[PDB]
Amino acid sequence: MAGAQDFVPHTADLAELAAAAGECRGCGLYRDATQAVFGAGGRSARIMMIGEQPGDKEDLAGLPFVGPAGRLLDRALEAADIDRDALYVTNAVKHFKFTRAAGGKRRIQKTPSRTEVVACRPWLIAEMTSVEPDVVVLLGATAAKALLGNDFRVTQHRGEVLHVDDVPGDPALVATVHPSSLLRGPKEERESAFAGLVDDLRVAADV
Ligand code: SF4
């Protein structure tokens, strides 16, 4: 077995899966991170949302999407008329990957390698098989690539309803921008990008 696969227990119970992920050594990222950050939500959710990895705040909160990026996504979900009872939100990698600077106000997130994404993917498959979502929203390049291939380009397929035969349960897949990209740039570009994120979320909610 490769990566996290022998660390994943034979259960679909999300509490048991989350506990087991706390003991995962499927790649090196568990060493420096505070804790594993599993997904949040319930198995009745119809929409699954996948980001890249927990960030500085999530690493310590023990919860996904608790910082500025989470607040922007919340603003977008509200504008797309998506109830939070319908969501299961998680990340492609479950340990924060980072370095620090000397005068930074945060620990600096680093990009997971394809090896780490592939190593952690067993947790994502377990989450997908446990929740059985009707649609999976892929927030950013790392998450999209995790399920759609290392060559996939979000910018080229944003907001298209995709279906790949290798994904368990054949949910609809919708790739979109990662909310953290929307925190930067000119006001009108952020406003334009925010409306496009809402669009992609509305496509997913209409699956
Ligand atoms: S990032 Fe994923 S595969 Fe790597 S140790 Fe953490 S939970 Fe396991």
Side-chain angles (χ1 to χ4, degrees), residues 3-30 32-80 82 84 86-104 107-165 167-183 185-186 191-200:
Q5 183 65 260
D6 201 42
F7 294 99
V8 181
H10 296 271
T11 180
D13 180 304
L14 292 171
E16 293 177 350
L17 286 168
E23 304 304 307
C24 188
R25 305 190 312 282
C27 75
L29 295 181
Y30 77 93
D32 291 354
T34 304
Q35 61 193 319
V37 176
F38 214 67
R43 294 180 61 193
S44 63
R46 66 171 210 275
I47 303 170
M48 175 172 290
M49 302 203 297
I50 309 177
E52 174 170 283
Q53 61 175 298
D56 183 22
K57 314 296 210 188
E58 286 76 20
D59 169 79
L60 291 159
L63 278 161
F65 291 106
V66 296
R71 297 193 300 265
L72 193 140
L73 191 56
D74 183 71
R75 196 165 43 96
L77 284 164
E78 228 250 338
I82 297 180
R84 230 164 189 255
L87 294 173
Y88 178 82
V89 195
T90 192
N91 292 287
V93 318
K94 281 153 172 79
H95 281 97
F96 174 45
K97 182 177 190 179
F98 65 98
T99 194
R100 241 188 232 274
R107 290 173 286 169
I108 307 297
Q109 199 176 100
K110 288 296 140 167
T111 309
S113 66
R114 177 65 173 181
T115 313
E116 289 157 340
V117 173
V118 165
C120 206
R121 198 169 50 197
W123 293 114
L124 217 51
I125 300 307
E127 285 170 306
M128 294 192 35
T129 56
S130 162
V131 175
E132 298 189 354
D134 293 333
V135 59
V136 179
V137 178
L138 302 160
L139 304 167
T142 299
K145 295 180 182 297
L147 299 183
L148 294 165
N150 198 41
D151 62 304
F152 178 79
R153 264 106 230 260
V154 174
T155 64
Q156 293 177 335
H157 297 287
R158 291 276 319 260
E160 292 169 18
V161 177
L162 312 181
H163 270 90
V164 297
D165 78 328
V167 168
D170 200 27
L173 314 165
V174 179
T176 192
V177 62
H178 194 273
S180 66
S181 312
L182 299 214
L183 289 172
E191 298 175 332
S192 181
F194 179 89
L197 172 59
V198 175
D199 286 339
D200 296 343

